[PDB]
Design a protein around this ligand. Structure first.
Ligand SMILES: Cc1ccc2oc(C#Cc3cccc(CN4CCN(CCNC(=O)c5cccc(C#Cc6oc7ccc(C)cc7c6CC(=O)O)c5)CC4)c3)c(CC(=O)O)c2c1
Lengths: 139, 141
């Protein structure tokens, strides 16, 4: 039972910070180029869109943001340390494939997210379909 | 109507709030645009299409037909912009936004709290469960 289990991490590119959330069971990702207020905002707007019940991070930075805890409490997210970067260097390759189609890094990040979530291998389901499948199976 | 959406704008506290509605489910996506249209709308649409099936976006004025960036995003992501929109849920949303406004320093935070409530509440099924139900019923169909 991992419908609402997510992984949260940072990555960096062109001197900017990319927050990345991974739905662990599906591989589905959401990201944004941005501190604690920013992380809390990102988590709230994630949690309004998917079932978000547990978020795992692997360092201490999110345990020291008062707004992040406030977001956790408001939305009912347990923020837990540990495990339930192949994804960040998979996201970075795609960002590289597209970087010249957009003026802003923002945009190239979101095109890369698009491709990651929509792409297949050939057959089966994309990450975007799996997360919907997982959730639909759930209720 | 799996990938059918309608896009509209609302205003609070001197700000603009882009609001995307998945017509069949009532599920909504919103964001406080710092500016007004243009590359803000194109970015919002690209994010949206990276998350959901977005095939047809309906609007009922001419504003989005005059943005080259919006047109570039429609064609990058495979979204047909279509005019006409044949409901009152900017109304609802601001109702919830008022219920929570004192819980957030920033209007955008309070908008996103309103989206949360609208999508999760009921009863039977919430908008958030329906859009998933509708989409999962479809992949297997
Ligand atoms: C083919 C194609 C397709 C798509 C395309 O698209 C584009 C584009 C674009 C673009 C154009 C212009 C501009 C920008 C970015 N612009 C926007 C505003 N940006 C301010 C951020 N500002 C906070 O993020 C912020 C600021 C302050 C506060 C917070 C917060 C919070 C918060 O959250 C909470 C959650 C829960 C709880 C309990 C509390 C909180 C709180 C605290 C509270 O409230 O109590 C957040 C700056 C940058 C982007 C292109 C063109 C291309 O590229 O070729 C393109 C091409």
């Amino acid at each position: 039972s991992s419908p609402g289990i997510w992984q949260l991490d940072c990555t960096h590119l062109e001197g900017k910070v990319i927050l990345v959330a991974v739905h662990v069971a599906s591989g589905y990702i959401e990201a944004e180029v941005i501190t604690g207020q920013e992380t809390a905002y990102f988590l709230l707007k994630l949690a309004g869109r998917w079932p978000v019940k547990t978020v795992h991070t692997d360092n201490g930075s999110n345990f020291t943001s008062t707004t992040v805890k406030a977001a956790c409490e408001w939305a009912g997210i347990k923020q837990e340390f540990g495990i339930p970067e192949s994804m960040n260097k998979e996201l970075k390759k795609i960002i590289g494939q597209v970087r010249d189609q957009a003026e802003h890094l923002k945009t190239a990040v979101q095109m890369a997210v698009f491709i990651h979530n929509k792409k297949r291998g050939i057959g089966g389901y994309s990450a975007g379909e799996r997360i919907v499948d997982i959730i639909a199976t759930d209720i």
